[PDB]
Amino acid sequence: VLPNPGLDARIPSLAELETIEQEEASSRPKWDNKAQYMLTCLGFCVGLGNVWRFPYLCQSHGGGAFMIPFLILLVLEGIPLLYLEFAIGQRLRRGSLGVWSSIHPALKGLGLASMLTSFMVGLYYNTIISWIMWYLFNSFQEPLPWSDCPLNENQTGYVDECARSSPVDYFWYRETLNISTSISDSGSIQWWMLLCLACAWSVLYMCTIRGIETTGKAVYITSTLPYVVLTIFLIRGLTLKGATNGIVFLFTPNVTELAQPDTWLDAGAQVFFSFSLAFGGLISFSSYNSVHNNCEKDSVIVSIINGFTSVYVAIVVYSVIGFRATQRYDDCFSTNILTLINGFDLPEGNVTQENFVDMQQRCNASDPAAYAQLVFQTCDINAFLSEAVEGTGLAFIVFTEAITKMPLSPLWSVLFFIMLFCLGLSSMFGNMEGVVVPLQDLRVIPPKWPKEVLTGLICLGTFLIGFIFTLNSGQYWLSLLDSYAGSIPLLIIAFCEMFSVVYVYGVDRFNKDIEFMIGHKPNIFWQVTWRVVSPLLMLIIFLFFFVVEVSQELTYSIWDPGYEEFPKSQKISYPNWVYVVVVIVAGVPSLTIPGYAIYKLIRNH
């Protein structure tokens, strides 16, 4: 165990903390019910990262190789680190920065890396909400806007790119975003998304005006709504035409795929983002309730209420992906049948889906010169499932075309998008708490000002920085920041704290501490998973990320309607300067830990 001098006289004495609890009646807020606490920590570690990043990170890796590693890494790392951070948040009685500043005070960097990364994530995790509510505004009309192609100035046919692609892709790629051909090409500001950005950053600031005592009621409402609308959509999904053909595709593991470092790294970077570990949000939430609270129970139940709603959203999403795939397959087959009969004049009900191959052999032996002119298609299932589906285009290109092929669609669409909105709002509640708490714990604003002014300043600042995603070339910036800021700094912060708690604070002190708090030493499981397995797994994930960054080309997809075979996605490389951004997003917020450590150890000569 590292020396760590002066650990006492900086933290409460373990024998007088229940006396300190009385001073917490006025200087700190407190939860009204236990239910509010469990719901807020349940509404913070769920949503938009189980529907918008999970199925993409599943499909890219086939679809079956991202469910075994995810669950192993869950049961091995998501639970123990979460229990650890709950227990600290309750013992040390301070926010997300005052804790890591009491353990070996040269470790205040974590209080800054966590703040910076919870800011960088919230920078775009709000413009996603902006797009969602822009879609929600376009409902409330009986013919859905994305159900037809608009005609040109010369009313004879559809516009070009609406004809060569789906009618729903000419609502996301040309009417909503108006995407330009390349990231180096950026144009106007696109007011009609400034409106939605302002509305999103206003709803958020209208809900979290005072930290707690104002997220309470919004947690009562917007953390139970998704758990009934999700079931309503599951019941409708499993009775579709193409169900049981997608959810069976989800669970067939391509065994030679989970033997690649890429899938392991993706599961590792996703199990920390499905929760909110290393964000600095759960420390502060678990720093309010009373002392003699059974910190274990809550931890375990939350760990098993989220990891369950992670395969309960994968089922509902793949139950729609399979439906869309089998629909396109039947359409291709009907088109082939039609191209055959229009060419040979056969009756209507003699070429059906089972005697097709024999009937096609039965014509080529009768008109060999008339047959070898028809351009047949090719279409087989298990090739329409693994298609070009990416984030920002999984919950807006799939669910919005399968929502218009059901009766009374102007209701299902509104229900689905209110589900997504009230599923993504909670997360931002927690994140804004995790960015506001360490700021006023830094004495950055004179303490005589109210809390509303600081929340308003943060909201205005992040809104004004959020003009970068509303340009034409806007979806590319978002894809880039999403990838890198969700991948790299999270796991390094998590490892650094998981090491600092068990090897700088002592594990035995923490042990008898939790013993006095709840009333029993933790089982052997927690001991073994805290002392050896958790840091060892982390190192592996780290090296895998470092071996999955070199030797893998850095490419992004463009739209470019002028390029031939246009329905397919064209893939190019970023310009050279982009690495600069890749630093300022994956650097400073994950390098201020050793930087501050060196600054503090070289201040003391």
Ligand X SMILES: *[C@@H]1O[C@H](CO)[C@@H](O[C@@H]2O[C@H](CO)[C@@H](O)[C@H](O)[C@H]2NC(C)=O)[C@H](O)[C@H]1NC(C)=O
- Give the residues lining the site for ligand NAG (CB under 6 A): 154, 178, 180, 187, 347, 350, 364-365, 368, 472
Span 62-81, contacts to ligand X by CB under 6 A:
62
From the list ligand NAG, ligand X, ligand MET, none, partner contacted by residue 431 (C-beta under 5 to 8 A by kind): ligand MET
Evaluate whether 78 touches 275 at the Cβ level (below 8 Å).
yes
Residue 48 touches ligand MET, criterion: CB under 6 A: yes
Token couple for 521: 């030493």
**From the list ligand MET, ligand X, ligand NAG, none, which binds 67 (C-beta under 5 to 8 Å, kind-based)?**
none
- Give the residue, chosen from 49, 62, 78, 226, that forms a contact with ligand MET under the rule CB under 6 A: 49
| Angle at which helices 110-137 and 451-465 cross, to 10° | 70
Nearest alpha carbon to residue 289 among 574, 593, 30: 30
Shortest distance (Å) from residue 360 CB to ligand NAG: 8
Could you say whether residue 431 binds ligand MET (CB under 6 A)?
yes
What is the nearest approach in angstroms of ligand MET to the Cβ of residue 274?
6
Give 183's contacts (C-beta < 8 A, 6+ positions apart).
Answer: 473, 476, 477, 556, 574, 575, 578
Stretch in the footprint of ligand X (CB under 6 A) among 117-125, 137-145, 252-260, 417-425: 252-260
Kindly state the smallest distance separating residue 356's Cβ from ligand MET, in Å.
47
CB of 187 to ligand NAG, least distance (A): 6
Is residue 330 part of the contact set for ligand X (CB under 6 A)?
A: no
Q: Which of 333, 321, 332, 315 is nearest to 385 (CA)?
A: 321
Q: For ligand X, which residue of 22, 26, 156, 256 counts as binding (CB under 6 A)?
A: 256
Closest CA to 353 of 325, 321, 385, 326: 326
Euclidean distance between CA atoms 280 and 291, whole angstroms: 20
CB atoms inside a 10 Å sphere around CB 119: 19
Choice between 39 and 258, CB closer to ligand X: 258
Question: Quick one: which of 22, 102, 513, 40 has its CA closest to 285?
Answer: 40
Note whether 252 binds ligand X by CB under 6 A: no
Partner touching 256 among ligand X, ligand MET, ligand NAG, none, CB below 5 to 8 Å by kind: ligand X
Pairing of strands 570-573, 555-558: antiparallel
**Is position 262 an interface residue for ligand X (rule: CB under 6 A)?**
no
Kindly tell me which residue out of 62, 78, 80, 122 binds ligand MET, with binding defined by CB under 6 A: 122
- 551 sits near ligand X (criterion: CB under 6 A): no
Per the CB < 8 A criterion, the answer to whether 538 and 491 are in contact is yes
Applying CB under 6 A, does 115 fall inside the site for ligand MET?
no
Sorted by sequence, the CB contacts under 8 Å of residue 602 that are 6+ apart come out as none
Region binding ligand MET by CB under 6 A among candidate stretches 114-122, 199-207, 287-295, 519-527? 114-122
Nearest approach, Cβ of 62 to ligand X (angstroms)? 6
The option from ligand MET, ligand NAG, ligand X, none interacting with 146 (CB < 5 to 8 A, set by class) reads none
Q: What angle do CA 49, 579, 191 make, to 5 degrees?
A: 60
Number of helices followed by number of strands (H, E) in the chain: 25, 2
Output DSSP code: residue 320: H
In angstroms, give the least distance from the CB of 47 to ligand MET: 5
Q: How far is the CB of 43 from ligand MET (least distance, A)?
A: 9
How far apart CA 345 and CA 347 sit, in angstroms, is 7
- Interface region with ligand X, contact rule CB under 6 A, candidates 184-192, 253-261, 406-414, 596-604: 253-261
CA distance 431 to 449: 22
Phi first, then psi, for residue 296 (nearest 5°) are: -65, -65
User: Judged by CB under 6 A, does residue 125 bind ligand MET?
Assistant: yes
- The answer to the question of residue 226 lying near ligand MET (CB under 6 A) is no
Q: Which amino acid is at 470?
A: T
Among 14-22, 119-127, 243-251, 459-467, which window interacts with ligand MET (CB under 6 A)?
119-127
Cα angle value 92/95/98 (rounded, 5°): 70
| DSSP tag of 173 | I
**Comparison of 298 and 433: residue with beta carbon closer to ligand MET:** 433
Q: Which residues bind ligand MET (CB under 6 A)?
A: 46-49, 118, 121-122, 125, 273-274, 276, 279, 427, 431
